[PDB]
Amino acid sequence: THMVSLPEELNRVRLSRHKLERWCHMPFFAKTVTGCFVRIGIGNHNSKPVYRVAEITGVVETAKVYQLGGTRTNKGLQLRHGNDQRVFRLEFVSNQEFTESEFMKWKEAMFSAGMQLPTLDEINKKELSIKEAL
């Protein structure tokens, strides 16, 4: 049984910000997005933007309603990166795909944390479930 090992594979279950925005008022937003991954902007280093791979483990409420695209929302994503779990507004989710470097960093962070990687089959099944639902 084969584990994820390439960014191209993990990109298959990467949700863009556009999609999150399109879907954020849908009735089964939580079920759909949970198990997917995102490329999240976590801040700047030397005034340059830094991004990480993270898995969505749930949907939660933020303190404030905020502006997201042309709507308004109270939803935040519970995100996991190795052992680091944090809540992020949807606005910091990128529309660009993972780089190989971001992916490798994630892999190493998952190993250091003693976390099991997703299998290729889990990925493909998740993706398929989303494509079928649309």
């Binding site: 999240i40 902007g41 976590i42 606005e91």
Partner: peptide, 8 residues
Amino acid sequence: GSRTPMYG
């Protein structure tokens, strides 16, 4: 595209 804002 439309610049992704950074957390913080």
